[PDB]
Structure formats: structure tokens, C-alpha cells
Amino acid sequence: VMALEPVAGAALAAPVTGQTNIIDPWIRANFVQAPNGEFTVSPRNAPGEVLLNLELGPELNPYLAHLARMYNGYAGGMEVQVMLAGNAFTAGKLVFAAVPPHFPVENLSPQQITMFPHVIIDVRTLEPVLLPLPDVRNNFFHYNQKDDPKMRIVAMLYTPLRSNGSGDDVFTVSCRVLTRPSPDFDFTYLVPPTVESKTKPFTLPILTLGELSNSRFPVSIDQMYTSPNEVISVQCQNGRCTLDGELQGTTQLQVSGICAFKGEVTAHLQDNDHLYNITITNLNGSPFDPSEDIPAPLGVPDFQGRVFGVITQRDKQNAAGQSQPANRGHDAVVPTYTAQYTPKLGQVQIGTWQTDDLKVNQPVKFTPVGLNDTEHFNQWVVPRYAGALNLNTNLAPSVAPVFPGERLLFFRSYLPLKGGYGNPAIDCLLPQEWVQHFYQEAAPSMSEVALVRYINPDTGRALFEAKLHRAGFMTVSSNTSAPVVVPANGYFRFDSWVNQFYSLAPM
Amino acid sequence: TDGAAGLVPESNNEVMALEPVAGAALAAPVTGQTNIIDPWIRANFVQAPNGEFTVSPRNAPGEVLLNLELGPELNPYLAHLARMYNGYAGGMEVQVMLAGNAFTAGKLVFAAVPPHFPVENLSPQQITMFPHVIIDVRTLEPVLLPLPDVRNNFFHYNQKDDPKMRIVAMLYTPLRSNGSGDDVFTVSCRVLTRPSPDFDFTYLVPPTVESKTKPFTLPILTLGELSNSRFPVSIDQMYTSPNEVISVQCQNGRCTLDGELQGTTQLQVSGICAFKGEVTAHLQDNDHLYNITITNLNGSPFDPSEDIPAPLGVPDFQGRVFGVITQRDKQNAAGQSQPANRGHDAVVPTYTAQYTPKLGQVQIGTWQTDDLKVNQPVKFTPVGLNDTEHFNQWVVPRYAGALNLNTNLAPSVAPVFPGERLLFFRSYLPLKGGYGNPAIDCLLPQEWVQHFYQEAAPSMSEVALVRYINPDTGRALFEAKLHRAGFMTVSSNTSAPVVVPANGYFRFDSWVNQFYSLAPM
Ligand SMILES: [Zn+2]
Numbered sequence A: 001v002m003a004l005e006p007v008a009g010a011a012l013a014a015p016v017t018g019q020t021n022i023i024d025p026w027i028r029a030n031f032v033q034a035p036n037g038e039f040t041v042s043p044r045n046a047p048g049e050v051l052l053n054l055e056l057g058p059e060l061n062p063y064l065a066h067l068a069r070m071y072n073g074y075a076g077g078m079e080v081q082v083m084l085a086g087n088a089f090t091a092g093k094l095v096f097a098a099v100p101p102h103f104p105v106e107n108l109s110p111q112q113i114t115m116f117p118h119v120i121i122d123v124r125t126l127e128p129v130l131l132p133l134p135d136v137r138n139n140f141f142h143y144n145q146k147d148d149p150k151m152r153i154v155a156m157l158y159t160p161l162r163s164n165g166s167g168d169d170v171f172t173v174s175c176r177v178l179t180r181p182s183p184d185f186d187f188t189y190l191v192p193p194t195v196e197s198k199t200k201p202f203t204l205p206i207l208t209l210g211e212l213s214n215s216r217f218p219v220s221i222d223q224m225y226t227s228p229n230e231v232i233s234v235q236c237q238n239g240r241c242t243l244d245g246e247l248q249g250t251t252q253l254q255v256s257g258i259c260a261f262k263g264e265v266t267a268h269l270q271d272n273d274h275l276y277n278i279t280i281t282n283l284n285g286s287p288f289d290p291s292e293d294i295p296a297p298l299g300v301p302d303f304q305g306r307v308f309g310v311i312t313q314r315d316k317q318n319a320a321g322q323s324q325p326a327n328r329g330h331d332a333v334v335p336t337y338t339a340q341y342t343p344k345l346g347q348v349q350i351g352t353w354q355t356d357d358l359k360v361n362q363p364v365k366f367t368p369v370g371l372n373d374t375e376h377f378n379q380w381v382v383p384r385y386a387g388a389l390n391l392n393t394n395l396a397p398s399v400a401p402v403f404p405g406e407r408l409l410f411f412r413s414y415l416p417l418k419g420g421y422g423n424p425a426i427d428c429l430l431p432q433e434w435v436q437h438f439y440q441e442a443a444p445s446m447s448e449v450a451l452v453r454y455i456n457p458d459t460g461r462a463l464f465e466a467k468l469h470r471a472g473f474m475t476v477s478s479n480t481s482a483p484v485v486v487p488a489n490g491y492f493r494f495d496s497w498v499n500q501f502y503s504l505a506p507m
Numbered sequence B: 001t002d003g004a005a006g007l008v009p010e011s012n013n014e015v016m017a018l019e020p021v022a023g024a025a026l027a028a029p030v031t032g033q034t035n036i037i038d039p040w041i042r043a044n045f046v047q048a049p050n051g052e053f054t055v056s057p058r059n060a061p062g063e064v065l066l067n068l069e070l071g072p073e074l075n076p077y078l079a080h081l082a083r084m085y086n087g088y089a090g091g092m093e094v095q096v097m098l099a100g101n102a103f104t105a106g107k108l109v110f111a112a113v114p115p116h117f118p119v120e121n122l123s124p125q126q127i128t129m130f131p132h133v134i135i136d137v138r139t140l141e142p143v144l145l146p147l148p149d150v151r152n153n154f155f156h157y158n159q160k161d162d163p164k165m166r167i168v169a170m171l172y173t174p175l176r177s178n179g180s181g182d183d184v185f186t187v188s189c190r191v192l193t194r195p196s197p198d199f200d201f202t203y204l205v206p207p208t209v210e211s212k213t214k215p216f217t218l219p220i221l222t223l224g225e226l227s228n229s230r231f232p233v234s235i236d237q238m239y240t241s242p243n244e245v246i247s248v249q250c251q252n253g254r255c256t257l258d259g260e261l262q263g264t265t266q267l268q269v270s271g272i273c274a275f276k277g278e279v280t281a282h283l284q285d286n287d288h289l290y291n292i293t294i295t296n297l298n299g300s301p302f303d304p305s306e307d308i309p310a311p312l313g314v315p316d317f318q319g320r321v322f323g324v325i326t327q328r329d330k331q332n333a334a335g336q337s338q339p340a341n342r343g344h345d346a347v348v349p350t351y352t353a354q355y356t357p358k359l360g361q362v363q364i365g366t367w368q369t370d371d372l373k374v375n376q377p378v379k380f381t382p383v384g385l386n387d388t389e390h391f392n393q394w395v396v397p398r399y400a401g402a403l404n405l406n407t408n409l410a411p412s413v414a415p416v417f418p419g420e421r422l423l424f425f426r427s428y429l430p431l432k433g434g435y436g437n438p439a440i441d442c443l444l445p446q447e448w449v450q451h452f453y454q455e456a457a458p459s460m461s462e463v464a465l466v467r468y469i470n471p472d473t474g475r476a477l478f479e480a481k482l483h484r485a486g487f488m489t490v491s492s493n494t495s496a497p498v499v500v501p502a503n504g505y506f507r508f509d510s511w512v513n514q515f516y517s518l519a520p521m
């Protein structure tokens, strides 16, 4: 067994806390499977590969993770149970170590894991083994708000697997990890339920692909499309929101505010076409301070191109008709690649085909429809938000799939044109409804990667799986670039929090 | 007992369901000294600095009337003792006296909230999910509450990064009354504290060195000794806000009670409505106009990328400020190498497009006296206003002209309790010519700004309760609310000069919150 002395639990925290609470005795007996508690050992693995990397806390047991939203703190350890699935005609060994709180586990040697409290178990063992996970700390108990590191338990391949195969498929030992609370685990102080943050679990909304919408243009979603070979690292400015609910770049919450602006008209020129320089405010009606940390006012376009839309004008003063002001609305185009599109400075220029009906010094409102033509349409180039004479500052960071053999997963939506030839599309990372749900919930991220699975509703089985990152993008494990053929009435389901080393099943 | 005729409840028989929590004896093997406290302070109830609060018919049910964090600053003897120690561990004992009239009817609820729980959005039924006790406002004998110091470490330090066990009061009924007369039956309540037997200090340090333990004090200065903080004159009288003015924004004379200067405020009395620079231009209209590249008031170049709306000390209202500009030559033309000097009248219009002091330019004027050198240093000394044309003191000028926005402004301030208006300090300004009697109202005197900057004491609440004391009579005239943003409000219905003796002063009474009903003037 692991050489560990007994560590105190919540009875140490008795004279500094006020309520003496208990829980259900049936939860203290049943062994519940850990959320990331499964791994398989293969003949392809090498010694020194980490397999579990578990950690102490109430997030292992989904009964304690539901009871934790009623209390103020906790203290105590757990009991781990490891099962294997092998037979007598095999060979190979595994090791299970006990790692302290502030010790960094980063690419350890197979020799160096024997310098911990460890057990070495063969892969032939018939009975499930029991390991202790104690609560080492330097205080009396843990708070549900202030998070601090805890004791981990780490599995590692010690000796490679030797067996003889059956056919075109090789033998494989599958392992499961189940936990239950120790007799000294306890909670501390009853509060109102579901009031404190930091205990709210991360979820996804149950909305199918036909009911969601794009986050970079106000068009519905058409299909899912994996990223091409020459696209490896994108950087957009709309549809950016982390899983904790922090809006980055020029991302806002309303669907209608995407590629939309509002303000007054100041200038008029007519070299060939009508120009109409326009000063802009925010989308609520406040004067835009140009020294804000944002790159631009929220909801301006974020790609090069010629956005075709309708601009309407409603004048302030009542000219006629018994005090009802006049209206006008025409087509226009905003080009985003020129040196006139400077929304950080506060000027956006439009273009109207031979229609001189737009009165100056009366406020307007732009409503986008589609593109003018496919000329200068690059959907992965950030425009110069200040024109020349200044560089782009304080953007969202670039995102990229770092795992070998993984591509980005986009949401494709086709687009109308004014005239010409082409079938263009705008790809986004997350839908707008996911952005709104992440902003309203604001649940914390326990890890850096989350695991989701696409669900077909009539069978209830998974079609593929992807990795949802903290920065707000998804990656799949595929080797081609093609639209994903799935039923349209499907959705994603959140499964667990994983590491950066989880290998997806090939798509 | 016998004086009340059985008309009121005599005692409350209800406890909070809390466990005995350890104190400073748990912390003994890891601390240094474990100092002790005088036994008279241990056994006598003394009024807390959060002592006073009232229940009124203006209060809605569900308002937080009291929010006491645990600390040594809950006792006025321990708050003086705690300025020479390093830490503490242990609880307190709180006593609430709320013996109201026999005709009223209302109830209060007191609950115990854990350390890391949010208290900002409690409903009246969420407060019953804690260990609570319900007390009506007619009980004769005072009630006793615990405050047991729940923590997850051995003791505390004087740092501000550990939340502590709180007590929270809430109004639970509407405070009705069935007296026959239309007379004020507003209940006055008091809070009295003393330390628990399991309370101790930790480690002797130099006294009054650390922050986080300095107490808030007011200076004893009469109204005849105060000075205006928006214009370099003396304060004449106090004057309530009119019914048209509901919120103000004036970047000079602004300082929080914690000791933070906001807007373009500074400390020097002579630097209000004054600047300093170099003449760079000459404009020959009917009047003579000049352009001045202004610097800071100490003699350093003004960087426009600073986090301020303007250089500190510029005028902060629309009008035409009248003063005297003077020149002293950087070179020596004559007289044993002594420089020559010129000094003439001036006028600074601040509502036009030529008053952009954030960009660096302030344009002045002199009438029919074009005797002013170029590329020589200047200084402006304000006297008053030349005419009341375009004079509005509650509009902030554009510090970068037209086609730009004001940045890093101080926030606007307004009263929120019903029936209350603002209380100003009014001084009357001289004019050059015309008919008028203008006035500039400030939120705070300049001496209070300097005192709050020198003390830098923390605030234990949002509002402080002060009273105006007449020292020859020994009787209080009125009371007011001093807010943490740096402004005072009174409870009145008119707009008139407050007629008081000019040798009276304000006296700091207690810390209150924003639901305190002031007495009507
Ligand atoms: Zn034109």
C-alpha cells in the first residue's frame, strides 16, 4: 500500500466554524465513476506516459457537486477504486503515485515517479485495488470561493504490454476509476442555495443546428465545415467569448448589432459616386470615446470586403405633415479595405449609386444584407481599424490547433450578393446563442479543455466528438476539409473537463 | 418595568443557532506575544462607531439597515488600541437597544452571513436561510447577538484580503402606528459592543505606522475660517440646492473621504483658476488676443497622455474669468542684469472654441492694450468675472474644443433618499462691470480636502453622520449626511441661506448608511 500517514479532516476545523453539518449516509457507500476516469493501455505506448492525473475535490462525485451549492466550505479526503480488464496471458505493470499540492507534474521520468508514495500493480490483477487520496493543506478548511491547489494522484505506464493478438485488432487493457467520500469528508456552513458563484456547473444550451445563428453576420447557420489546409491560425473580432463569459474584441450581445453602425452625417463629396462621410456612436446612443481599450465600437465588420446594405434616415425636426418627421432609405456599400474606413477614429464612408437623396446633419442607421461582389473578399484579414498612421491595438488573441492531426471546426453560412458570380460564405467559431448563454451563466472553467459530443436524437448515440477550448473555439480530429454530413436536428452535449493531452477518436 | 404599563414586550427569548467557535487560544503556538486587554474594556458595553440607525415610515421593507463586519474597529477603545498591534483573533458581543413607542408596530430580522458569501442581493426570504432571529421594534430590554469569528486559518493580519463573519439587519414590516396625532414616532436605535472573552491582540508594532487602522476625523474649523475650493475667495454662507439642480459635476474641489483627488483638483489655494505658460501668438481684432502654451503649475511640461481631463487647477465652468496676467523676461535687457516686467488685465472665455487646455492652448484677451511680448513666460492671477454673460457654473467646459470628448471626468453626485437636497458652500464673486450678484457653490472646503489627503483614513461605511454645533449655546442646530464621494445632503423643502452663527463647526457623530432618515430642518 501507499506509505501515507493519516491526515485530519473536517474535525480539525471544529472550534473555528459554527454549524456541525452532516450529509446522507448512502452517498458515503456507493462508488461513483470519476468524470475523466477511464483510460486504455495499448502495446503502442511507451514507459513514462501519464494516464490519469486526477485531483481531490467535490467535483469528482456528482452528488457532492450538487450538495456543494448549499454550503460554504469543506475539508476531507476520498477513496479511489481502480479496476482493470485483462486475462492471464498478458504482461505489463502500472504505477500509482501520490503527488503533493504545489508540486508541478510536467514530463516526469519513469524513474522519478518511484520517488513518491507509490504502488506497482500488474495488469493481470483480478480484484479492484483501493488507494487513499488525503487532504493535505496548510489551513483549517477550504472555502467554496477561494480556490487553492490540492493533492493529485497520477498513473503512469511502468512496463510495456506484452500479449499476443487475435487478428487485425490487437489486445487492449481498459481501466475504470471510481471514487467515494472518506469517513472524514464533511461540509461546513449552510447558505442559500445557488447564490454563490464558483459552484455553478458548466453546461451547453439544448439548441439544434437549425435553431442557432451566426455570430459574424446576421444570417442563419447552414452547415459545419472543417478548416482547410492553408488555414492554420485565424484571428477574428466578432463571435469571441471565453467559456467563463468574457467578451473579447468587438463582440456584443445583440444579433441585429452585427456589422451595424449608427450616427450622424457630416460630409458630402461626389468625385464619381456619392460618398457621405459619417460619424459614429455606439449601438445604444452614447458618444464613442476614441481612447477606450476596445479596438473599435462594438459591432462593426471585421473582414475585408464590400458590405452591401440599406441606410435609412429620420430627421430630427418636423418639416411637414403636422409634426411627423420625414424618412428616406436607400442602398449603400461600406468598403472595409480602403483608407476611409476608420471606425477607431470615428469615420465610416459609404457609397451610393447615383442617388443624391441623403440630407446632411441628420442621423442615420445602417442595416446590412450581404456583399456587393466577391472582389477583395478576404474573410480572414483584420482591417486597419484606424486606417493608416496607426496600427491595430488590443485585439483578441489568435487561435490555433496545437495537437498533431487536428483541424478547426467552423460554422458555415452562405451569403447574398448585389450582383456577380460566386458562392461565398462566412465561417464563425461559436454561434451567437452560445455567446449569450456563456455571458449569462458565467460558470468557471475547471480545466483548459472541455469535451463535447454531437448527438443524433432518435438513437441517442454519438456521431463525432470535439474539444471546446477556454478561448472559445472547437477542434476536431480529421484529415480532410469537407462539410460535415450530420442530421440537422442534432446538438452537442458537454461530457467532462479534460487535459491538453486527450487524443480524440478519429473522425 | 413598571413604568411601561404592560403596553410593550419586555424581553426577547430567541437565540441564533450558532456553535461555539475558538478564539485566540487556538493561535498560541504560531504567534509571537499574545498581548492582553484592560479588564474594564472587557466587561462594559460601549457604543460602536457604527452605533446609530433609525427605522422610519420612509423605509421600504427589505432594506439593509445594518451591516457589521467583524473587526477591532467595532469598539472605540479597541480602535485606539489596535493601532499598535499587528493582528487579532476572536469575536465580539453586540447589544441593540430599540425600545420604541407603545403605538408603533414593526419587526426586524438579524442574520449571520458566512465569510465568502455575497450580501449585495439578499431577498427578505433569503435572509431566513441563515441562522436568524426576529425582533420587534417595541422590546424594552436590549437584545444580544453573537459574532463568532469563523475562519480557516489561525489569526488575521491588518491586510484587507480576508472576508469575515457579518451580521445583517433587514426591515421586515412597514412600521405602522395608530396614534391619534400626526406626530413623529420614528424609532431611534443604538448599537453597543464589547469584546468576547476569547479575544486578543497579536504582536506589538510601532504605533500609528500601518494603514488600515487609521481613524476618520474631522478638523475643528469654524465657518469663518473655511475657504472656497472652486475659486480663490473665502466662504460666505451655506445654501441649499434649488429644485432645478438635482445632480452636479464640477471637477475642482473634489476628494473622497479615503483621500483620493479626482478631476483637476489639487492642494494649493493659490492655484485655483490659474495657469502658467508662454505666449506664442498675436491676433489683432478689435480686442487683442494671444495664445499661450500652458504647462503644469510646478514648472514641468504637460503631457497630454496623462490620466486627467486637463492640467490641474484650470477653471471648470463656462464663463469669462477676469484676472491679471504678468510677464517677467527670461533674458536681461538692463539694470544690472535685472529683467523688466509688465502686468495688465486679462479675460479668459471658456465657452468658446479657443479654450482647449487639454490640447495645450489657452487663448486670452486684453482690451485695447497691445503691450505684451512674445516668447516670454506668463502667469495668470484670477480676480473674478467681467460680466454675467454666458455664466453657468454647472456646465463642464470642453477641454479639447469641439469635435472631441471629455475623458477621465469625476462622477456626478446626487441625493437618493426621499425628501433630501444638496447643501452647498456659497461665495459671492466680484464683477468688473454690469449688474449682477453671482455666486459659486462648492461641495467641500479646501481645508477639508487637504485634511482628507493628509490623513488617508479608510471609510467604514458610505455615509457619515455629522451635526452643526453652536459653541456659545451648546446646542445642535441641524444635522447632515457626509457622503463618501465628497458631498453633503440635508433634509429640507426650500432653497434658502441656512442662517447659522459663523463660529460654528461640524462634529462627526457616527457612521450610517443610505437609508438613514435625517431630522427635518
Ligand atoms: Zn453627392
Ligand SMILES: [Zn+2]
Pocket: B282, B283, B284, B285, B287, B288, B289, B370
Ligand atoms: Zn494686438
